């Protein structure tokens, strides 16, 4: 990464026993090793020890790990949607909406005081319900931002459609920003007005022929009330019986009649349709940027909750004694993630198993048949020591 | 009888779904256009169960139409012809069972 950070850093969360030691360069204290040795001393190490959770049974523990995994992808998904909606809106910064400091406070710094945040999550509560609350929160937020955008996209279609009705191509446009009683009528008893959109090539032919096209046409009414670059818009006033014959003669000639009425309700409704679509989109727009932003921070804190809890839960389940773990979150300066992960795998992996530590630099991922599998769903190779990698 | 009908429809319904994706086009549009008679119709009859007479239906198959005039999709067309054969039999199970519901 190099554009998906602008004031963040990338993180590895690991948990080890307080008895763990490095075999990269023996004799060293784990705490000293992280600072001095890990990628040339550039490593910024912060505390991330979270206290105990109640645990009911051995069976239930297993079921907890299942929930932590799925929800965590689901929340990751939910951040993916929110960020996609901000870009969509055309909110891009050089330091936000593609990095976004948690609550306008740098990301490594937020994690350094993330020692189990409380927003309605309590360290004396039962573990299961808390997992559910965090996942519920995010889901509801996710539905909200999605639902509001749907209405935004729909609202934009009404404005666009309506802009052609007020001025554009003649096949959906009839005038209604202006209305005069000598260019439009339909509130007579004998008279109506029909608008004929005639192609610009055919234009001189329209002025010569229109009188003759039907009976009882108002003399000298054909003039260009509107014009574009494809068709010209005409007004002709005529007797109401002739309106059907007139339209009909005209379509044969290859002039194309454009339906308009001097009905007040239609005129008032066309103007209103444009204005209302715009008003609606504007209201949605402010609400949506704000909501995404608020949603973002919340979805971020919840994500970090899951990961912190998922490393604690995993650590107790694989290691057992001692009760307390030495947990650190190491900020890797950008594009040195791989080399960092390798120096850790080699240092701590021995505890997991003598054959289970292989050299790997970069996340190995397998998904081919049941002979190669890598995931917390199913696996047949993984990290020998407990490690989750967090990238924004 | 609700489960029996559910299943008979579902197994047939899936085969119909499979036939549509495998050939390479959506048939259901063409089928709707071709149909303007109902092959499988019913005859109403009263059966005395207890004191009171209940309404019953006995299906009869009338030869208005045999298949539909749309198959000719070369190799993929045999999948659609066979799909009808399996469904004509499924629908009939539903109809006889449906009588009891009434």
């Amino acid at each position: 990464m190099a554009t998906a950070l602008y004031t963040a850093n990338d993180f590895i969360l690991i948990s080890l026993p307080q008895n763990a030691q490095p075999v990269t360069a023996p004799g060293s204290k784990t705490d000293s090793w992280f600072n001095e040795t890990l990628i040339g001393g550039r490593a910024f190490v912060s505390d991330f020890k979270i206290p105990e959770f109640k645990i009911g049974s051995l069976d239930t523990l297993i079921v907890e790990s299942e929930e932590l995994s799925k929800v965590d992808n689901q929340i990751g998904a939910s951040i993916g949607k929110i960020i996609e909606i901000l870009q969509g809106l055309n909110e891009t910064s050089t330091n936000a909406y593609r990095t976004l400091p948690i609550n306008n406070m740098p990301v490594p710094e937020y994690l350094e005081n993330f020692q189990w945040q409380t927003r309605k999550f309590k360290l004396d509560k039962s573990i299961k319900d808390l997992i559910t609350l965090i996942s519920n929160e995010s889901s509801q937020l996710d539905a909200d931002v999605r639902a509001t955008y749907a209405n935004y996209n729909s609202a934009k279609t009404n404005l666009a459609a309506a802009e052609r009705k007020k001025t554009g191509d003649l096949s959906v446009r009839s005038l209604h920003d202006i209305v005069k009683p000598e260019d439009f009528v339909l509130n007579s008893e004998h008279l109506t007005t029909v608008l004929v959109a005639v192609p610009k090539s055919l234009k001189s032919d329209f002025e010569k022929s229109y009188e003759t096209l039907s009976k009882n046409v108002v003399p000298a009414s054909a003039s260009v009330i509107a014009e574009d670059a494809e068709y010209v818009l005409f007004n002709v006033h005529l007797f109401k019986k002739n309106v059907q014959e007139f339209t009909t003669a005209a379509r044969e000639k290859k002039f194309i009649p454009r339906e308009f009425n001097y009905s007040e309700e239609l005129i008032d409704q066309l103007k209103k349709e444009h204005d209302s679509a715009a008003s609606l989109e504007q209201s949605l727009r402010v609400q949506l940027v704000r909501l995404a932003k608020t949603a973002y921070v919340d979805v971020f804190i919840n994500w970090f909750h899951i990961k912190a809890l998922r490393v604690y839960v995993e650590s107790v389940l694989r290691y057992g004694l001692p009760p307390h773990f030495n947990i650190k979150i190491i900020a890797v300066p950008p594009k040195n993630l791989s080399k960092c992960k390798s120096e850790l795998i080699d240092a701590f992996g021995f505890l997991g198993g003598n054959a289970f530590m292989k050299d790997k630099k970069g996340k190995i991922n397998k998904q081919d048949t049941s002979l190669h599998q890598y995931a917390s769903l199913v696996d047949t190779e993984y990290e020998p020591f407990v490690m989750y990698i967090i990238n924004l | 009888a609700k489960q029996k009908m559910g299943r008979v429809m579902q197994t047939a319904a899936f085969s119909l779904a499979e036939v549509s994706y495998a050939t390479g086009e959506n048939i259901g549009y063409q089928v709707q256009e071709s149909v303007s008679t109902a092959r499988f119709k019913v005859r109403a009859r009263q059966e005395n169960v207890s004191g009171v007479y209940l309404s019953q239906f006995e299906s009869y198959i009338d030869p208005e139409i045999n298949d539909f005039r749309l198959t000719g999709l070369g190799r993929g067309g045999q999948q659609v012809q066979r799909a009808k054969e399996i469904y004509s039999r499924a629908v009939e199970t539903l109809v006889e069972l449906a009588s009891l519901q009434t």
Binding site: - | K2, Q3, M5, G6, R7, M9, Q10, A12, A13, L16, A17, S20, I27, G28, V31, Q32, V35, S36, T37, A38, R39, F40, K41, V42, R43, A44, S55, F57, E64, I65, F68, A83, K84, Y87, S88, A90, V91, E92, L94, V95, A98, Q101, T102
Partner: protein, 115 residues
């Protein structure tokens, strides 16, 4: 009596195609209207299912049996519950990708009261 010989469909697209292969619906010759309503998930209206249900149950009396998918029947639940006659019969059969669920079934609600 014998004056009703038509089967109307309210079903999802793929299910209605199947039923129609067997041949049970049609485009009537006395009214020019189907005896089927083609429905799609998340792409057709809640109001249209309502109109179709009424049309076949009360404004049509030549429908013998109206088949209806439970899932679709659920959308328009008020209207399914509220038609209580046996002419035409209203029969909820399990929808597609769902087995028998008793909680969507209009007729079973009627049976509960008295035995």
């Amino acid at each position: 009596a014998e004056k009703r010989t038509l089967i109307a469909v309210i079903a999802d697209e793929d299910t209605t195609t199947g039923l129609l292969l067997a041949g049970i619906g049609q485009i009537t010759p006395e009214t020019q209207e189907k005896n089927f309503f083609v429905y799609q998930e998340g792409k057709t209206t809640k109001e249209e299912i309502t109109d179709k249900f009424n049309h076949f149950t009360e404004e049509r009396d030549d429908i013998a049996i109206l088949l209806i998918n439970q899932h679709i029947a659920e959308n328009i639940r008020a209207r399914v519950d509220s038609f209580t006659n046996a002419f035409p019969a209203i029969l909820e059969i399990p929808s597609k990708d769902h087995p028998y669920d008793p909680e969507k079934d209009s007729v079973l609600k009627r049976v509960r009261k008295l035995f």
